[PDB]
Design a protein around this ligand. Structure first.
Ligand code: PRO
Ligand code: PRO
Lengths: 439, 435
């Protein structure tokens, strides 16, 4: 009956709420942000401890030894420091993030220490693995084989709050997100490695997603889908597709910013204004009421009015001061948060769509679809916080109660982990359904 | 500290939950259905009373006299029977439905009795009046006039539960909603009374509603919009329009059933849907050309809708009074709300307010609500809670007004609109000036 929560940010709040229901656990919290931990201590009964991870490793060793379990809700670079204390002190661990190559090297040491370290929990990586392996294990139980695996997931605002040029709202500064439009995408299609070029030509790969008629979505492949053959164990499959869901016109609006030359890490040029900045990008002197409009509309896709109106709406042509930043990308990101932030009583939404093609030994081809949908609570937590938070907290509770016997470094791929979690998420307001057809 | 809730439907559950929070009121329930009141009596602490409003009018007179307030959640035709008991015994009342012409005749007797009766509460009629009068009173407070009033509302499934030919799920047997396509529509637009016929030509009146880009809606006008000029006091307006909201493809699917001749009350002919469809257009196998020929000029979307529901299959047809009622029992079987499937309410008002300055104010109001997995539906909350809140205001002694009335005064709509945010019913406002 003792747990340490390293981190005091977005994901930490729903984790503390879930554990505090039963009322038989001494919850300690460790973080850098002094303003966050004091406000969090008012709501939930916890033991606040100011502690740096890298600089103050000494007190971490003494503190972690007292506890039973360690819930790491920190950035994924710092997990080897947290895991190093666990293997020496002989205590369990849980993570809501990627198992990195650095953490993979400790796997030999973790099994020798005789402790459990679960990783890759939450939304993605997390619930995407659990839904996939549930369906893949069910197929292999009846002698079937996986021929195709198409999957899509997206964290969005609720439809009612989608009335803006991007049809989106940012929780934090999208510095890492916007630069990923320039990256390529790779996936498998009918036994052929398809490669999609990024940047300006990436709008060609954005297709309509009409699986929910009422919801007006679009979709596109991301990063790398061939990776999931070895992980899930479906090398026989002829198709492997992983993608992201957005509302229609999102990618076309971002494509406008790529055309103007805003998506780059070059430095900036009386305070600077947005009217003056776009004049430098297009290549004119800063003096233009409606002359910069004619210059911008010419550059934007050869007279794209929708992209011009989007820049007009955000105030990129008008007279507004540019925030202090290291680059043009950081200036755009800071402005997008200021203009398109979440309100006090505005919901968010998670949608996840899987589609399996399962060949049975009888000869028939089963088409199995899986939907997972969750809305954010008005007087509660957001859908993103719940889907990322609750699987980590549930997995932690299983270790304390003694419902997981396996040892070593591991994901949520085994039925011992994912089975209980998928059953319990129904009560937390995260509903998922199944539909099957044969042909 | 005592109240009677007449009726034991799905609307009563959120009303009983709201009143039982503080724990300072002895709630009583009266209904015909013995199964409902027993199951409802298990959840909330209530006194069950087995009685019929029409058959046993004597015990109603004695029971109502004991209570401080009455809450009628019965069909709207039976309000004069409840109202007659209230005026005799001198007891207050609230209603979650229309104030009919029959109930309007009692207004003289209600004023002499010296009691409060508040009608037209819930989603529609109810919250439509509250959102409207909040905006109209604010306009008249600054000497402005209403030129345009365009409004839309709709109860429908959540986006994730919309993958079906109609993009809809029914709670009970749809008898009236199918026949409502045959009825005509009337509204005011630019200083003239417009009329739109039902039947085959009604599909032309349907238009795309793209106020939320992420949501894929359509809309069409209600039976009558001209009545709202006298109600809200906006005869000066040149455009009045109240309409219904659905997902795209709903009316186009229903238009297909009108082409085949399914929507008609003329009695039924073991019978099957394959046999019935051939008679309208027995016969040989396949013959898909007969269905698609009558159903528009090669409309594949409307044809596949019939195949999906199974109107060409060999399923049994239920015992019904007509062909329309037979289709209602089939649609409620196939397209139905499951145990873990959420619904949604969406409401959209649009005003054109002319100030004495000369500028035109374009004001918009959104009201949205979702169902709860471990709770009540969006339809149950928006219909139930306004009547429950109005019941609490009478007991606490906030509503000082007397006689028969709606929720048109700021005394009524003001407190209710403020409190609904806490119950999970969010509504927002936006305004822009246009010279
Ligand atoms: O891109 C998004 O919206 C989410 C983030 C994790 C997976 N999909
Ligand atoms: O037909 C509909 O969907 C709306 C719901 C409330 C009033 N009419």
């Amino acid at each position: 009956r003792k747990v340490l929560v390293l981190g005091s940010g977005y994901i930490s709040e729903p984790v503390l709420e879930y554990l505090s229901r039963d009322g038989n656990i001494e919850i300690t919290v460790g973080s850098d942000m002094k303003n966050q931990i004091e406000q969090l201590g008012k709501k939930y009964n916890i033991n606040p401890v100011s502690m740096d991870i890298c600089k103050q490793e000494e007190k971490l060793g003494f503190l972690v030894a007292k506890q039973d379990l360690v819930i790491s809700l920190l950035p994924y670079v710092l997990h080897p420091l947290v895991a190093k204390a666990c293997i020496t002190n002989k205590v369990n661990m849980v993570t809501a993030s990627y198992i990195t190559p650095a953490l993979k090297e400790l796997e030999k040491s973790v099994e020798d220490a005789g402790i459990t370290i679960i990783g890759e929990l939450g939304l993605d990586p997390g619930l995407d693995h659990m839904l996939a392996m549930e369906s893949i294990d069910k197929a292999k139980e009846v002698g079937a084989t996986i021929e195709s695996y198409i999957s899509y997931c997206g964290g969005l605002p609720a439809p009612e709050h989608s009335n803006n040029p991007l049809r989106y709202k940012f929780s934090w500064s999208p510095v890492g997100v916007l630069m990923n439009v320039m990256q390529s995408a790779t996936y498998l299609l009918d036994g052929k490695v398809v490669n999609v070029a990024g940047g300006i030509s990436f709008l060609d790969a954005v297709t309509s997603m009409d699986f929910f008629p009422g919801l007006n979505l679009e979709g596109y492949p991301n990063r790398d889908s061939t990776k999931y053959a070895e992980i899930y164990g479906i090398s026989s499959a002829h198709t492997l597709l992983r993608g992201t869901l957005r509302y229609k016109g999102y990618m076309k609006a971002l494509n406008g910013f790529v055309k103007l030359g805003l998506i780059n890490r070059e430095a900036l040029p009386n305070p600077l204004t947005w009217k003056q900045l776009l004049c430098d990008l297009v290549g004119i002197s800063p003096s233009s009421e409606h002359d910069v409009l004619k210059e911008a509309v010419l550059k934007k896709l050869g007279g794209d009015n929708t992209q011009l109106e989007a820049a007009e709406w955000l105030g990129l042509l008008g007279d507004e001061q540019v925030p202090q930043a290291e680059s043009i990308l950081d200036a755009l990101s800071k402005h997008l948060v200021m203009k398109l932030s979440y309100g006090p009583e505005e919901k968010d939404m998670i949608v996840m769509r899987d589609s399996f093609g399962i060949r049975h030994p009888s000869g028939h081809l089963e088409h199995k679809t899986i939907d997972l949908v969750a809305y954010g609570d008005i007087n509660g937590f957001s859908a993103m916080a719940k889907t990322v938070g609750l699987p980590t907290a549930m997995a932690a509770k299983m270790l304390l109660d003694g419902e997981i016997g396996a040892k070593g470094l591991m994901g949520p791929f085994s039925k011992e982990i994912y089975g209980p979690i998928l059953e319990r998420i129904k009560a937390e307001g995260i509903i998922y359904t199944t539909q099957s057809t044969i042909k």
